[PDB]
Amino acid sequence: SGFRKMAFPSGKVEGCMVQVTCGTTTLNGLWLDDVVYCPRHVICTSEDMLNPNYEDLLIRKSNHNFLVQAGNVQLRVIGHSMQNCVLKLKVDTANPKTPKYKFVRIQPGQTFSVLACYNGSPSGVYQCAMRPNFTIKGSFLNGSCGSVGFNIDYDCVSFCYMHHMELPTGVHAGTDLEGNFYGPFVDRQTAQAAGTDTTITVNVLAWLYAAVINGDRWFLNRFTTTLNDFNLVAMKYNYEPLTQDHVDILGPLSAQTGIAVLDMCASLKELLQNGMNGRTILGSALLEDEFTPFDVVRQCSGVTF
Amino acid sequence: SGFRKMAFPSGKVEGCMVQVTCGTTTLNGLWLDDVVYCPRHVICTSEDMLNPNYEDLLIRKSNHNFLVQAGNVQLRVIGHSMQNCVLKLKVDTANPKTPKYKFVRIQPGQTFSVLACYNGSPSGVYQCAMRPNFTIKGSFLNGSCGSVGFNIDYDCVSFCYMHHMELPTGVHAGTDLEGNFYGPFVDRQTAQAAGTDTTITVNVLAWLYAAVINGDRWFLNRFTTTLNDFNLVAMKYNYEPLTQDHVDILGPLSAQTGIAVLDMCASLKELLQNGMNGRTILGSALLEDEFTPFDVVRQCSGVTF
Numbered sequence: 245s246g247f248r249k250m251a252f253p254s255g256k257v258e259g260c261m262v263q264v265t266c267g268t269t270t271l272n273g274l275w276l277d278d279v280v281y282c283p284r285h286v287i288c289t290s291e292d293m294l295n296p297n298y299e300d301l302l303i304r305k306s307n308h309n310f311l312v313q314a315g316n317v318q319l320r321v322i323g324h325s326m327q328n329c330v331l332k333l334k335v336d337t338a339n340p341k342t343p344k345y346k347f348v349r350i351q352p353g354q355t356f357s358v359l360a361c362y363n364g365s366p367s368g369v370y371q372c373a374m375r376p377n378f379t380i381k382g383s384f385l386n387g388s389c390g391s392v393g394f395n396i397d398y399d400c401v402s403f404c405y406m407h408h409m410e411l412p413t414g415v416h417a418g419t420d421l422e423g424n425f426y427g428p429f430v431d432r433q434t435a436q437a438a439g440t441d442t443t444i445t446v447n448v449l450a451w452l453y454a455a456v457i458n459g460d461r462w463f464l465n466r467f468t469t470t471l472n473d474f475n476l477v478a479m480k481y482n483y484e485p486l487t488q489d490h491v492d493i494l495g496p497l498s499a500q501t502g503i504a505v506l507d508m509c510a511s512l513k514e515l516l517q518n519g520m521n522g523r524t525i526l527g528s529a530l531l532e533d534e535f536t537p538f539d540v541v542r543q544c545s546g547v548t549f
Numbered sequence: 550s551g552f553r554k555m556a557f558p559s560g561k562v563e564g565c566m567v568q569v570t571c572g573t574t575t576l577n578g579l580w581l582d583d584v585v586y587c588p589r590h591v592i593c594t595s596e597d598m599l600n601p602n603y604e605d606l607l608i609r610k611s612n613h614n615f616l617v618q619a620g621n622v623q624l625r626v627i628g629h630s631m632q633n634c635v636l637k638l639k640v641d642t643a644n645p646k647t648p649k650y651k652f653v654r655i656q657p658g659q660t661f662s663v664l665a666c667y668n669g670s671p672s673g674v675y676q677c678a679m680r681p682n683f684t685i686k687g688s689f690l691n692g693s694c695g696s697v698g699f700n701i702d703y704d705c706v707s708f709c710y711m712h713h714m715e716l717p718t719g720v721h722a723g724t725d726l727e728g729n730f731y732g733p734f735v736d737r738q739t740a741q742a743a744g745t746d747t748t749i750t751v752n753v754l755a756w757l758y759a760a761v762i763n764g765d766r767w768f769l770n771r772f773t774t775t776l777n778d779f780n781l782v783a784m785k786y787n788y789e790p791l792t793q794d795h796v797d798i799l800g801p802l803s804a805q806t807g808i809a810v811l812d813m814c815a816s817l818k819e820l821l822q823n824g825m826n827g828r829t830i831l832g833s834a835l836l837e838d839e840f841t842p843f844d845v846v847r848q849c850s851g852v853t854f
């Protein structure tokens with residue numbers, strides 16, 4: 245028993261992290277086969293970032309201007325190209341530690357592990373969620389850009405995120421590994437506002453199921469509701485609307501616990517209207533939304549890699 | 550910026566996890582050089598666990614009764630011995646992935662990463678703390694026994710924990726890698742009560758410093774206190790007494806932020822007496838105590854491995 249915010253094992257990703265330097269800007273790259281992926285803003289100065297013309301900046305860069313170092317060992321850059329907001333540095337050596345991998349663009353509400361790095365060296369790993377407004381709430385200091393987010397399925401690493409920037413509100417924005425930003429963000433030092441950060445309802449319900457499975461059931465009330473009635477309350481409280489697709493995804497947890505999804509919705513409705521009254525659920529005084537139904541099933545069943 | 554519960558990168562430990570089976574009991578082992586370490590209760594049946602005589606049970610086991618599998622590949626056991634509550638299975642093959650490693654016995658209040666495994670395969674990694682009552686609050690299902698806790702210093706893995714058992718209260722007990730239990734626990738299916746779980750005061754203060762560094766300062770009050778006055782309040786609230794050694798350990802965070810340790814103690818005193826009043830600190834509605842001062846400095850400075 246017990247329920248923890250749990251990251252995927254990071255080994256397969258550790259073996260892919262390199263340092264990329266373009267005169268005095270250093271950040272992280274991802275080395276897969278004979279390509280190193282990194283944020284294109286590695287090529288920007290101080291002043292460049294206010295309104296960079298990446299096309300024009302990149303024309304003044306040669307292969308030999310991109311310093312790529314894997315531990316103590318320098319990689320030879322034999323080509324470079326720009327795909328959306330990432331650079332692909334083609335190196336003369338295939339990463340011998342390349343795992344089975346996919347590039348996947350994730351949906352808001354989905355969770356992934358981040359391997360926070362500095363100077364191409366891993367510092368730590370943590371599990372987070374793509375917020376509905378396409379930000380993440382990470383832990384990223386200067387030099388963490390190029391750190392990646394990922395999921396593992398058995399032996400295959402699905403890379404879903406590369407870190408590009410901290411907004412002035414201290415939340416984080418980045419791209420998929422095709423260099424397309426999540427949400428409306430652009431890789432420029434400019435006024436960029438996140439949309440409203442709604443709570444991921446389906447994840448809160450998953451976590452309430454995790455709570456019941458792990459023995460914390462005080463919030464189970466004598467009530468039920470309908471999707472429409474529940475969603476009236478969700479809307480009031482800045483929760484994402486719950487769909488029949490979400491109900492279907494919660495089916496296996498509903499089956500395991502014997503608690504109908506709409507009964508759990510009625511429990512969540514009361515928690516939103518009444519608060520916790522100084523009580524906790526799985527050691528938290530707030531409704532957690534960074535566990536997917538798949539995370540709860542995975543953790544509660546003991547799936548491995 | 551941003552502040553996350555962050556685990557060490559798990560790669561170095563992933564390469565050491567094996568499956569150990571002793572007729573129909575399967576759990577995890579740690580393969581370092583030519584030795585596999587695992588909980589000695591691998592040799593127990595159902596009924597054995599009520600009052601096992603490990604000396605006597607082990608005499609009926611031969612090398613060939615210990616099935617050790619590293620991924621798909623069987624390891625040849627050429628010796629076995631019992632050290633306290635762990636078995637050392639001497640195998641004919643040195644683990645080629647053995648990292649630089651120490652065995653360290655940690656102090657209550659210190660944090661470490663757990664690589665949760667099943668059948669010798671890593672499932673996930675999470676950061677936790679040795680509680681003052683020598684339990685940990687982990688995420689451990691049937692088959693997770695032999696999962697290890699560790700810290701990394703640059704390239705050296707300090708193994709501090711091996712998982713042995715869940716108490717009937719759903720908290721977790723285990724040993725150092727010399728097989729000595731943390732706290733009073735024994736590897737038997739018996740009435741075992743944890744002592745009082747006090748809050749790790751020095752860690753809460755570290756986390757309040759992390760909060761200030763990351764911009765959440767609403768709890769900074771106009772007051773100071775003394776160690777003795779603060780400790781009167783600590784005792785009331787089941788906080789560990791704060792010592793001058795703790796104050797000294799907080800020095801670098803006190804220096805970074807310009808907030809005197811005893812001023813932060815006065816902030817903590819008011820939070821304990823008044824509660825949060827529906828406010829949050831670093832996105833939490835409770836006072837977090839599973840970050841050490843060293844964790845806060847490490848995360849806030851970007852130390853790598």
Ligand SMILES: *C(=O)/C(=C/N[C@@H](C(=O)OCc1ccc(F)cc1F)C(C)(C)S(=O)O)NC(=O)COc1ccccc1
Pocket residue numbers: 271285288293384385386387388389390408409410431432433550
């Ligand atoms: C990626 O690595 C990166 C981080 N940026 C830092 C930054 O520049 O500040 C660092 C800093 C450290 C210590 C100080 F005392 C003062 C500092 F400013 C921040 C995230 C702002 S900081 O850790 O809060 N880059 C970005 O976030 C975005 O960078 C760009 C670069 C070019 C174009 C657009 C965005």
Ligand SMILES: *C(=O)/C(=C/N[C@@H](C(=O)OCc1ccc(F)cc1F)C(C)(C)S(=O)O)NC(=O)COc1ccccc1
Pocket residue numbers: 245576590593598689690691692693694695713714715736737738
């Ligand atoms: C270590 O791997 C281990 C876990 N024990 C389990 C257990 O036995 O129950 C598993 C279980 C799974 C699914 C069910 F429907 C019912 C079950 F009981 C628990 C931790 C109790 S469970 O995950 O809560 N072993 C131990 O924790 C301690 O084992 C021993 C063995 C011998 C001597 C002493 C202790």
